[PDB]
Amino acid sequence: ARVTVQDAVEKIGNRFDLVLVAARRARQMQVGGKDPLVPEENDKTTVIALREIEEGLINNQILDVRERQEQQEQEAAEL
Amino acid sequence: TTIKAAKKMVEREEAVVWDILDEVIREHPVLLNRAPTLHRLGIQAFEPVLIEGKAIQLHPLVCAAYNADFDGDQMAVHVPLTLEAQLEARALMMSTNNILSPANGEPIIVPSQDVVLGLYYMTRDCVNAKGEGMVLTGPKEAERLYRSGLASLHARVKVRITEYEKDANGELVAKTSLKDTTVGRAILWMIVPKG
Amino acid sequence: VTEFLKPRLVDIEQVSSTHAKVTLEPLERGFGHTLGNALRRILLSSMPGCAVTEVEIDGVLHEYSTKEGVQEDILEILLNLKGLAVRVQGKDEVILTLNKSGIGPVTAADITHDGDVEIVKPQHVICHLTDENASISMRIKVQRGRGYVPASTRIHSEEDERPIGRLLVDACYSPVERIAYNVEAARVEQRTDLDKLVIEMETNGTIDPEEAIRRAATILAEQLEAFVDLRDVRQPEVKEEKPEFDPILLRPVDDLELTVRSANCLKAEAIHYIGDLVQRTEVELLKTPNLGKKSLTEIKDVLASRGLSLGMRLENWPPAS
Amino acid sequence: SVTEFLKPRLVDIEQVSSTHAKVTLEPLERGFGHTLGNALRRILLSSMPGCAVTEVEIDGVLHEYSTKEGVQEDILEILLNLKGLAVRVQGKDEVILTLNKSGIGPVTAADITHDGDVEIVKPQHVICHLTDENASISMRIKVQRGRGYVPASTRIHSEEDERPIGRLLVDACYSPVERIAYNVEAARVEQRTDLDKLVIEMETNGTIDPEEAIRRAATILAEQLEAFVDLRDVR
Amino acid sequence: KPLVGTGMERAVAVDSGVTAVAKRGGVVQYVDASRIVIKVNEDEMYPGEAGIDIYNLTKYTRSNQNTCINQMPCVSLGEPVERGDVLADGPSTDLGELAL
Amino acid sequence: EIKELLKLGDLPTSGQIRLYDGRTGEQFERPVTVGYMYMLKLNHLVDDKM
Ligand SMILES: [Mg+2]
């Protein structure tokens, strides 16, 4: 569950980029087919995305690094 | 399997669809909206809980911001329907994220008449009541003595409080001291956080 | 159906090992309120235990005293003593002493250790002592009471004799310190609202909170034992005695949903009761005047549709008229 | 003594009227008075075995919003009076009663065709009024035993029971008790003080027996308490 | 009936055309949920080609606001009634008294 | 006049009667007033609003 997001506002520069990176993570988790790095409690993708953002291991920089890693893995598998 | 079977089951409203409805509204917020919208608080986000009835149960502390009395006011509900949408409603339009009005720094979550009357009666001390002059260890014992009926609600009593003060850093120093306050304030002390 | 619903607890949180949060789900629409109220009113007052009831300082004989050797007033001493829980064996009354001096504060571990009693928290600080030249001692008597005895009733206990000038402390024999029950909505597959109970309790640590709940349940059951159905089912016995003749036969023929015409035709032959008519074959009807087609059809319909028929041989008639 | 106290016991079912009854539980040590009083009151008001009417069938009228030449009141008033009527059944759980009446007069409960295990609590209870000589009423009344209270709306299960037009549904409001007051007073103990005796007065429909309903409610409360008398983590 | 009334209620339920008003005071002859037949007294009866009065009560029919409008007879057989007195309480009425 | 009409019956003159709670079963302090009020169901039923 999730009630307040002020702790997320603390770790991110503002709320707009926060919800943007959260939506990107939610797209990666729901239709992207990626596993959640935090054990869920029968919550939706938005709640677990916000929780993983609050834990500090996921943000815009981490997400673009992961995207670059996935792209280079894909182009190495294709060859 | 198909959409027709699900539609027929929803129309029939079997016992196997209610749990699905509870699961889809586990963390899917909705948007409450008043008919005349003045400021940002005219539309808010809330997590819905299912209730058997035909009316929308509303929190008493938020309708003051809505300027919505319960004399027959009808309000509307909307669904975000998108991941970006649900995350935005949970992040920005949520009621918790809007505690101060955008006009003035004063909080918009100010309590209403019922709760403030209850607390005033709880703390308005008299001169003589059941248990005037006794001593209580903690607020839990005060609540026990009150609910037991052996004492009144408002009476000057010497109790012991254990308060916490925030130091320069993120430290919560603890100090236990004997105060002379009414039983109502001592009982209410179990609610306020330590800071 | 007259068969109620029994709840199945799903959460017993034992945070801090001395404050329990139990749940109960599901209940009836009003069972949660009454059960929480009963459990609270029982645990608050009617719950036997043990606590301090007498204190006597060898040098101080009044609650108001500028006592040296301690940096705390006598009121704080009485409060700390009231906050000291102890479990005692079958001996329902026992005294102890606190002969101790020193530099640091006297705690519960400094009480004279007796096998008849048991302190729940030895590290519980009792009274801060002056670092030097402070040799104070006091005796404490504990008993086995019923519940909370406030100072108003306690000062009445003082009013009895108090011959030595005995000091006093608020007696709280209830092992539970605080209790709060809350009812919320619980949903069954199609049930509107059921009472989901959540009880947060906190005891003196002398007994487990779940054990206290169990003891309260057992004491309430023992209280209600005088009226519990007199048995488990109280009627595992089904006997069916039925005579051969039916009681419908004793009733008059006017109770068979028949027209006034048919009623008059039946009363013409002085046949009032149904038993006087069931022992009569239809051979004696179409010979009766005013019994043609409509009346005969009505008679044969409203009489035989109830399972029986018109015309039978029986001898048990009329019992008893 | 200080521990292992006594238990109460029923001593009187003295009734001041045919329905207004009074019971006296005694003795109670301390504080159990208000506890048991509130508990028994809530259990009695919550749900007790009732035998109100559920379905009616009048051959003449087709829907409760119609009339009939001969009856003074309307069909709605008839349904209201039938709901207000009380009755006691012992053997079975559901029964069908027949009422046939003719001639000018106040048609009351005493005019129905009773049965063996069917007992009318009061025959003076008026049902309707026939205001015509050549006018008659023949009706069927379904009475089933239930627990609590169910309206006429949510009780629907299939779409065939209402296919017979003559079948009309009334909200099954079965509650033997109607008001339950209680008060504690000083009990007469042999050698003790501050023992409480609980006097419970009940204004009921007269259908259920006072002692029977009291013991039934006590057993229900004990069974509900049994849920956590041996509480343990089980799902 | 409303408990704390104003006295004016005895007029609204009568001066309007919602309840069954007695055009001629007479003796009640036939009471029924649908019709009410009254026998005119000898004095108020016309000296020629006269008879008895009949009031056809309106049953449950749709009003202009999707509400039910029904009249209920509030008289007994043989009970003499006066001219202008009420015979059947219409919707939200009780013995010739407004009761909303 | 209302006071003497109340005192005509056995009802209390002050108009406020002690009331017991339906849930806790205890006595409400500060005796609440209670009487018989005529009320109306407005033509704003919820079944035509939801
Ligand atoms: Mg308004």
Side-chain angles (χ1 to χ4, degrees):
Chain A
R2 187 49 52 87
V3 296
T4 49
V5 299
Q6 187 74 18
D7 209 337
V9 185
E10 199 279 328
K11 202 172 301 301
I12 319 296
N14 61 84
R15 272 169 278 100
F16 294 157
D17 62 342
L18 159 67
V19 71
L20 280 179
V21 68
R24 184 179 167 189
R25 176 87 284 179
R27 289 191 306 266
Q28 285 206 14
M29 292 299 180
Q30 196 249 329
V31 285
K34 305 306 170 58
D35 50 348
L37 306 182
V38 164
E40 59 189 15
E41 296 86 359
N42 263 27
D43 312 333
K44 261 188 167 299
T45 61
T46 72
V47 194
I48 62 180
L50 286 178
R51 194 142 40 193
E52 297 182 51
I53 288 178
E54 288 275 21
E55 284 202 5
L57 76 163
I58 287 180
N59 63 77
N60 181 270
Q61 184 171 346
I62 303 304
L63 272 197
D64 63 59
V65 162
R66 177 63 59 180
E67 186 266 345
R68 175 53 52 189
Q69 175 191 358
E70 186 72 22
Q71 203 281 327
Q72 63 93 20
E73 282 300 271
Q74 194 86 350
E75 66 90 21
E78 290 189 34
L79 196 140
Chain B
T1 60
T2 179
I3 185 180
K4 208 61 170 296
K7 179 178 303 178
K8 206 63 61 182
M9 287 168 52
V10 162
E11 174 265 323
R12 188 187 298 104
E13 199 58 27
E14 307 167 351
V16 79
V17 76
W18 283 122
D19 59 355
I20 302 307
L21 188 45
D22 198 3
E23 185 54 84
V24 299
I25 321 297
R26 178 65 181 90
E27 286 283 343
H28 197 301
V30 300
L31 262 60
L32 313 187
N33 167 53
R34 185 71 156 87
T37 299
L38 275 298
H39 39 282
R40 302 188 299 151
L41 309 176
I43 289 186
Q44 295 208 6
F46 284 91
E47 289 182 10
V49 291
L50 266 66
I51 52 172
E52 280 85 334
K54 268 68 55 180
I56 298 179
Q57 272 176 348
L58 182 58
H59 199 272
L61 287 176
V62 57
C63 47
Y66 274 82
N67 194 21
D69 53 355
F70 293 88
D71 61 350
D73 289 16
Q74 315 169 19
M75 76 165 47
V77 291
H78 300 258
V79 181
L81 188 140
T82 315
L83 273 178
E84 296 87 316
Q86 296 173 46
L87 272 155
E88 160 77 6
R90 178 160 281 101
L92 272 77
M93 292 184 295
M94 213 57 178
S95 85
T96 54
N97 306 321
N98 295 332
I99 59 173
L100 316 180
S101 88
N104 307 329
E106 274 77 15
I108 198 63
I109 203 54
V110 71
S112 171
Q113 48 264 18
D114 277 346
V115 286
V116 75
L117 163 67
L119 296 180
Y120 170 79
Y121 171 78
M122 190 196 301
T123 66
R124 186 202 61 89
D125 64 87
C126 74
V127 292
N128 190 21
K130 300 194 55 53
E132 163 75 15
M134 65 198 312
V135 288
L136 275 298
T137 76
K140 321 174 182 181
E141 291 298 326
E143 180 201 6
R144 163 159 86 167
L145 180 66
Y146 167 63
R147 275 306 189 185
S148 86
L150 299 164
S152 88
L153 187 46
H154 38 275
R156 296 187 175 90
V157 174
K158 305 199 61 54
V159 311
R160 180 212 293 190
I161 62 154
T162 74
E163 49 180 6
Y164 299 81
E165 294 171 342
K166 178 173 296 300
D167 208 2
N169 50 6
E171 282 183 341
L172 297 91
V173 306
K175 35 187 302 182
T176 70
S177 302
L178 280 75
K179 299 299 189 305
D180 190 13
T181 52
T182 193
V183 193
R185 292 165 190 170
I187 287 180
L188 196 53
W189 182 255
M190 269 164 43
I191 296 302
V192 59
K194 310 174 188 58
Chain C
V1 297
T2 72
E3 309 317 304
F4 289 74
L5 194 150
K6 305 186 64 60
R8 300 301 165 184
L9 61 91
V10 307
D11 189 13
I12 313 289
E13 170 181 349
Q14 212 175 21
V15 54
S16 315
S17 47
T18 179
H19 158 68
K21 172 197 294 294
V22 304
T23 194
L24 283 176
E25 188 273 338
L27 276 73
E28 214 62 30
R29 294 198 302 108
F31 282 4
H33 269 292
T34 179
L35 291 180
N37 182 25
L39 268 298
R40 174 173 54 176
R41 204 156 311 277
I42 283 181
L43 286 181
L44 280 188
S45 88
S46 57
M47 177 48 63
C50 283
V52 292
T53 187
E54 160 186 351
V55 56
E56 265 305 282
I57 297 92
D58 53 359
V60 164
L61 212 61
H62 294 269
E63 63 93 19
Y64 53 104
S65 163
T66 80
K67 178 53 168 53
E68 50 90 16
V70 293
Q71 48 271 49
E72 288 79 15
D73 54 350
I74 314 299
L75 285 181
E76 197 158 349
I77 307 175
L78 303 190
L79 212 67
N80 291 281
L81 286 169
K82 175 185 174 183
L84 174 63
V86 54
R87 58 181 292 170
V88 193
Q89 319 306 131
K91 183 67 61 55
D92 53 332
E93 175 180 15
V94 54
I95 70 174
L96 304 96
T97 57
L98 192 42
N99 297 89
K100 181 213 174 300
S101 188
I103 307 90
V106 61
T107 176
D110 309 323
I111 303 289
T112 50
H113 318 84
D114 294 328
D116 206 4
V117 301
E118 167 190 348
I119 315 299
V120 63
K121 289 182 299 180
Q123 83 293 339
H124 179 273
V125 176
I126 293 187
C127 282
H128 290 282
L129 192 75
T130 293
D131 316 320
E132 198 270 334
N133 195 24
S135 158
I136 193 50
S137 174
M138 57 286 295
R139 57 193 48 81
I140 54 167
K141 178 184 87 180
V142 303
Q143 291 173 335
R144 185 172 305 271
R146 185 63 62 189
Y148 201 98
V149 183
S152 300
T153 45
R154 274 289 92 185
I155 204 172
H156 184 71
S157 316
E158 274 179 351
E159 195 265 332
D160 293 314
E161 195 58 37
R162 57 183 179 92
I164 303 172
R166 192 174 56 186
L167 274 301
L168 202 51
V169 68
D170 294 321
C172 52
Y173 296 107
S174 316
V176 62
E177 299 191 30
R178 72 170 296 255
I179 179 178
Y181 82 101
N182 187 15
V183 60
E184 59 192 345
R187 185 194 70 259
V188 191
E189 59 87 19
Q190 219 163 9
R191 185 78 69 170
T192 78
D193 185 327
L194 289 198
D195 294 3
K196 183 181 182 64
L197 181 52
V198 174
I199 300 182
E200 295 92 343
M201 72 178 310
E202 199 159 358
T203 78
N204 265 322
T206 186
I207 47 180
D208 271 359
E210 55 155 347
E211 167 59 35
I213 280 182
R214 193 183 325 275
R215 198 157 306 168
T218 52
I219 199 169
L220 187 54
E222 289 185 356
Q223 198 76 281
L224 260 188
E225 182 61 37
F227 318 102
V228 285
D229 197 65
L230 300 102
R231 210 185 169 91
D232 43 18
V233 174
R234 96 181 164 89
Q235 197 79 9
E237 169 90 353
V238 191
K239 184 226 295 183
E240 201 176 0
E241 163 183 316
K242 41 166 298 304
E244 190 270 312
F245 79 106
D246 293 1
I248 314 295
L249 267 51
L250 281 167
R251 303 176 63 189
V253 297
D254 310 332
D255 313 336
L256 291 181
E257 190 72 284
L258 74 164
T259 69
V260 55
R261 197 177 193 175
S262 53
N264 169 80
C265 311
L266 283 186
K267 289 187 175 182
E269 287 288 336
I271 307 178
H272 302 165
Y273 316 104
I274 296 176
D276 281 353
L277 197 54
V278 305
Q279 205 178 6
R280 182 191 193 93
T281 298
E282 61 88 20
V283 305
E284 318 291 335
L285 302 192
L286 71 163
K287 313 307 293 183
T288 304
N290 313 337
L291 280 194
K293 37 178 290 184
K294 179 252 181 179
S295 55
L296 173 64
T297 307
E298 287 282 333
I299 287 301
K300 75 166 69 72
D301 289 13
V302 303
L303 183 135
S305 171
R306 299 168 56 92
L308 56 91
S309 198
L310 190 147
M312 270 172 295
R313 284 300 162 269
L314 58 92
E315 290 81 10
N316 44 6
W317 177 256
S321 159
Chain D
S1 167
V2 290
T3 45
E4 314 183 60
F5 50 81
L6 54 90
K7 55 189 60 181
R9 42 183 53 92
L10 198 145
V11 293
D12 196 4
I13 314 100
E14 176 263 346
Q15 316 173 14
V16 300
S17 86
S18 309
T19 59
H20 188 181
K22 284 179 54 181
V23 294
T24 49
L25 308 184
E26 61 89 19
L28 297 184
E29 283 278 347
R30 170 67 74 84
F32 290 98
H34 274 271
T35 312
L36 286 178
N38 173 254
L40 290 182
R41 183 201 187 280
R42 291 190 47 82
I43 295 302
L44 284 177
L45 271 301
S46 87
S47 88
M48 293 299 298
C51 297
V53 57
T54 293
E55 193 175 33
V56 70
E57 209 289 327
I58 302 181
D59 46 1
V61 58
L62 278 77
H63 53 89
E64 58 270 9
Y65 315 97
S66 167
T67 178
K68 188 172 184 57
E69 308 89 352
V71 292
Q72 182 181 13
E73 285 109 341
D74 205 316
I75 312 298
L76 296 184
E77 280 288 336
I78 291 182
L79 300 191
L80 194 142
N81 290 276
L82 287 188
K83 183 219 305 183
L85 183 138
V87 74
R88 178 197 314 175
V89 295
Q90 300 181 355
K92 57 199 70 63
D93 295 2
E94 62 96 7
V95 76
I96 290 183
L97 267 53
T98 78
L99 162 59
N100 314 324
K101 195 60 183 304
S102 295
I104 302 180
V107 191
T108 179
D111 304 315
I112 76 181
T113 67
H114 65 86
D115 284 321
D117 51 350
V118 177
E119 275 71 33
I120 294 296
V121 63
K122 44 168 186 174
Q124 296 88 356
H125 185 54
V126 59
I127 298 306
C128 46
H129 300 270
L130 282 182
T131 68
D132 189 12
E133 164 62 34
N134 45 7
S136 199
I137 43 169
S138 76
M139 67 177 63
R140 271 85 69 185
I141 287 177
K142 179 179 181 180
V143 166
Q144 56 192 17
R145 161 178 294 182
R147 182 181 67 85
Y149 153 73
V150 289
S153 60
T154 175
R155 205 183 61 256
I156 58 181
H157 42 86
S158 48
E159 279 72 21
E160 52 91 17
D161 62 71
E162 286 314 278
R163 287 300 180 85
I165 317 297
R167 285 305 212 185
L168 269 62
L169 303 188
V170 291
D171 49 348
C173 168
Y174 36 86
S175 158
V177 308
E178 280 201 345
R179 91 188 175 93
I180 308 287
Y182 72 99
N183 47 1
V184 303
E185 60 181 4
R188 205 54 54 184
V189 64
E190 43 273 18
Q191 63 270 7
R192 231 178 307 270
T193 317
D194 64 87
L195 275 80
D196 295 353
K197 167 175 53 182
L198 170 59
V199 175
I200 296 181
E201 57 270 37
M202 58 183 77
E203 190 62 271
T204 174
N205 302 334
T207 295
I208 204 60
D209 186 75
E211 180 186 8
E212 150 74 19
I214 282 299
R215 303 208 85 145
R216 173 60 175 175
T219 308
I220 294 154
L221 180 52
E223 182 175 350
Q224 283 304 308
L225 172 74
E226 192 273 331
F228 57 93
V229 73
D230 52 334
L231 73 163
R232 198 56 57 94
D233 176 59
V234 57
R235 290 94 191 277
Chain E
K1 47 187 178 304
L3 297 190
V4 188
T6 62
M8 195 80 166
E9 303 84 355
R10 279 286 173 79
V12 176
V14 172
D15 293 328
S16 181
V18 191
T19 57
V21 67
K23 298 188 301 178
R24 283 188 295 273
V27 180
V28 163
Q29 179 173 347
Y30 178 63
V31 168
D32 210 329
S34 88
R35 66 152 59 87
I36 294 182
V37 193
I38 309 301
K39 189 172 306 306
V40 194
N41 296 326
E42 307 282 348
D43 44 9
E44 292 188 355
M45 193 175 54
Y46 268 86
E49 58 262 27
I52 55 188
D53 306 337
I54 291 183
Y55 296 96
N56 292 325
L57 259 62
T58 178
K59 265 314 173 185
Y60 306 95
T61 176
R62 178 182 163 274
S63 62
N64 305 86
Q65 302 298 137
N66 304 338
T67 79
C68 73
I69 169 158
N70 175 34
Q71 297 166 330
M72 301 154 44
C74 47
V75 295
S76 309
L77 303 99
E79 184 177 20
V81 298
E82 308 285 339
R83 175 175 42 83
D85 198 313
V86 295
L87 292 90
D89 298 332
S92 70
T93 46
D94 180 22
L95 303 190
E97 195 175 39
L98 183 48
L100 308 101
Chain F
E1 310 171 27
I2 305 187
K3 290 297 185 55
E4 70 186 22
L5 181 57
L6 273 161
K7 91 174 60 180
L8 169 60
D10 307 66
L11 310 174
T13 304
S14 157
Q16 302 182 346
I17 318 179
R18 173 184 294 187
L19 191 67
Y20 289 162
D21 184 20
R23 313 168 305 164
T24 65
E26 71 177 358
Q27 157 194 344
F28 284 126
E29 72 273 18
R30 299 291 305 276
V32 57
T33 193
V34 58
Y36 266 57
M37 161 173 285
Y38 195 70
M39 297 196 56
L40 307 168
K41 174 187 177 184
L42 271 301
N43 197 259
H44 283 267
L45 81 172
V46 51
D47 286 5
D48 286 359
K49 302 305 185 180
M50 180 205 64

